[PDB]
Amino acid sequence: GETTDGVYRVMTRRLLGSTQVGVGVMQEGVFHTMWHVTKGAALRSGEGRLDPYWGDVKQDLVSYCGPWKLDAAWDGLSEVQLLAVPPGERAKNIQTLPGIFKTKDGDIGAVALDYPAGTSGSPILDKCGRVIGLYGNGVVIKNGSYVSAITQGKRE
Amino acid sequence: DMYIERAGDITWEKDAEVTGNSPRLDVALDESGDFSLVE
């Protein structure tokens, strides 16, 4: 299958037509997405098969073919880019200054950008092009707008 | 069977559209991975 580094759409033929359920990042031979996109199921890449390797429902992350490889972090000061890949639409970079999610276990960066559900798994990047996390697990605030955490895994 | 399709390179784009605000929110994360607002 296609193992080239880059951003990919995650598709299913189980529903009506071909529906985009999410997005992911192929880096160093490992496919990275959010758990709620695949529910831990196997994936197809052309005629090849990608098997889950690691996953955690609470972090809402999953890696295929190998361990989680993404370890860059938001520096807490700079603007970032959401490389949004919406269903049926071309990949587009959106620059923003992240807000913060304050939790009892520490603070997390957050991006206030609203996209369709099938955009979950789109990468958030720093100025060096490094993936600092994935978009798609967050909350809906008073004004009905969406705010996603910048969700990053641990590179063992 | 879910399948993947390439959508692009992962690179910073100079002159990308700049938008979105930066809210500071108190949140809670449950065992199911769901975030909720704390008030």
Ligand SMILES: NCC1(c2ccccn2)CCCC1
């Ligand atoms: N803005 C639509 C929603 C979403 C979920 C994940 C990623 C992006 N958008 C669908 C559920 C409520 C928020």
